[PDB]
């Protein structure tokens, strides 16, 4: 029993404690990244069949992005795939849906990366791991690798009879007679409450518009703070660039023994609020 030897390989990093109590409401899905995770069978295929003699490597993370888009598209277009798993759509029939797919609020993150005026790299939050930085966009991966990866994923989808590759919990089905099965769990029982009066609906409609405005005001303040920190990051990046250039100027200047023109080599105080 007791200790597992590979723990330190699987659990790395540091959680920094804050003075005030943690405030958090993001879901597990919010903090996991791409929902598809390669198993041992996936990596041997990626190592030996895809990247064996490739000039352009498909990274493990890029692979999972592709499979994740395939899963989301099939669930949208073929919800009853298990009725006839071999009738699963081809890559070309599915490609229109993959192009429009909005994975993990990508369009929202892109808009935010635009609004900040950063446009540099990608919009990074606490929910993102730093290893995900190196990945290419989905549309580019679809063109270069889409059909090849889909051929592989398609077979795995057929093997599991149109269900999930990852083992799923057994949930109750509303047409099944049922049979006292201990593996069936987490049954759902809706609230079903009577409607409010029409007047209260109108009053709550007004409260809804008011709540929308307060969220808009909050987003403006939040965007301004993000802009403030973004330009602050640009400033320290300049101070780092100015430092390296100032040292190189002086060394070359000292080599050639030139005097004067020292205005840019020192800082000048100015009227700042």
């Amino acid at each position: 029993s007791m200790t597992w030897n590979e723990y330190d390989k699987f659990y790395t990093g540091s959680f920094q404690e804050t003075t005030s109590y943690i405030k958090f409401s993001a879901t597990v899905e919010d903090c996991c990244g791409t929902n598809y995770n390669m198993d041992e069978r996936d990596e041997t295929f990626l190592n030996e069949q895809v990247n064996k003699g490739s000039s352009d490597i498909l990274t493990e993370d890029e692979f999972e992005i592709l499979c994740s888009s395939f899963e989301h598209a099939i669930h949208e277009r073929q919800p009853f795939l298990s009725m006839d798993p071999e009738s699963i759509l081809s890559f070309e029939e599915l490609k229109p849906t993959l192009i429009k797919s909005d994975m993990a609020d990508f369009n929202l993150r892109n808009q935010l990366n635009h609004e900040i005026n950063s446009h540099k790299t990608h919009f990074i939050t606490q929910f993102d791991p730093v290893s995900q930085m190196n990945t290419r966009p989905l549309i580019q991966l679809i063109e270069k690798f889409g059909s090849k990866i889909y051929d592989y994923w398609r077979e795995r989808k057929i093997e599991v009879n149109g269900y999930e590759i990852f083992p799923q919990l057994k949930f109750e089905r509303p047409g099944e007679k049922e049979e006292i099965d201990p593996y069936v769990c987490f049954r759902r029982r809706e609230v079903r409450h009577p409607r409010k009066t029409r007047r209260i609906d109108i009053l709550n409609s007004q409260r809804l518009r008011a709540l929308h405005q307060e969220l808009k005001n909050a987003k403006d303040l939040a965007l301004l703070v993000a802009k403030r920190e973004n330009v602050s990051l640009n400033w320290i990046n300049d101070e780092l660039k100015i430092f390296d250039q100032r040292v190189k100027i002086k060394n070359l200047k000292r080599s050639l023994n030139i005097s004067g023109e020292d205005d840019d080599l020192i800082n000048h105080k100015r009227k700042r609020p």
Partner: protein, 278 residues
């Protein structure tokens, strides 16, 4: 029939390998695996070691998905709503069912609150135990199911869990008792807590004290108080009302108890207001 036997083989949660005791409705496909991995922060289950590795590289969560409502230098408590954190709470209930025989996973986790006790580390907050609680309990139960994880026994964690459940009830200005029939190990742990807090209250207060005044200070129901006094042989009946006194046994137990120097919940570090459900 199937539910009356151990379901899974051997499980590695975080760095510790644990041995399940009872059936749990994990995906039946996992019963064919030698090892099952449980993520130490999300409680997510894995049959494949490679999927686990990929998951750990992308998982940024390092504590229970909710607000920290208590913190001392030994443990922290997180308050998690089953309706808001469905995936995480299901994972917790699946894990808990491995070590609780009579917990039901029949319905979804929405009607429960989960108070999760953690110990902090360089890596983050590691779940060591928890207790669930109905958002609205008809019988006034302040605990539904309560569990200390097997790898964290012999650390006094169970006592802290029980203390914290009553500290919430005291802040709620309610009396409370654990749900319905208690497990054998659960019944043992509550009787120990009930005796300890009763003898501690009686000795330190010194004066005579009413049943209702004891119920007011500890949030223990009169039922639990009376039964605790009967076991300690310090309850008597006079003029239609029950009375608790002190003897040589209670003063002796108190000295032994105070010598133990156990870890305790500090109510001043509980920053928490009762959730309001419409």
């Amino acid at each position: 029939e199937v539910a009356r036997v151990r379901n899974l083989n051997r499980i590695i949660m975080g760095k510790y390998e644990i041995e399940p005791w009872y059936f749990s409705p994990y995906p039946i496909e996992l019963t064919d695996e030698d090892f099952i991995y449980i993520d130490d922060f999300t409680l997510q289950y894995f049959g494949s070691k490679k999927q686990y590795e990929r998951y750990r590289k992308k998982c940024t969560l390092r504590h229970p998905p909710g607000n920290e409502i208590y913190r001392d230098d030994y443990v922290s408590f997180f308050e998690i709503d089953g309706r808001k954190q469905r995936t995480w709470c299901r994972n917790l209930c699946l894990l808990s069912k491995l070590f609780l025989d009579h917990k039901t996973l029949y319905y979804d986790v929405d009607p429960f609150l989960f108070y999760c006790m953690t110990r902090r580390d360089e890596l983050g907050h590691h779940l060591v135990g928890y207790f669930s609680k109905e958002k609205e309990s008809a019988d006034g139960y302040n605990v539904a199911c309560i569990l200390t994880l097997p790898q964290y026994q012999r650390m006094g964690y169970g006592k802290l869990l029980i203390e914290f459940s009553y500290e919430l009830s005291k802040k709620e200005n309610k009396v409370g008792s654990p749900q319905k029939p208690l497990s054998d190990l659960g019944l043992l742990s509550y009787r120990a807590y009930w005796s300890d807090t009763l003898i501690t209250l009686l000795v330190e207060h010194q004066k005579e004290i009413t049943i209702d005044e004891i119920s007011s200070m500890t949030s223990m129901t009169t039922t639990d108080i009376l039964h605790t006094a009967k076991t300690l042989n310090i309850l008597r009946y006079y003029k239609g009302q029950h009375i608790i006194f002190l003897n040589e046994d209670i003063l002796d137990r108190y000295n032994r108890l105070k010598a133990k120097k156990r870890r305790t919940i500090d109510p001043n570090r509980l920053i928490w207001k009762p959730p309001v459900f419409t």
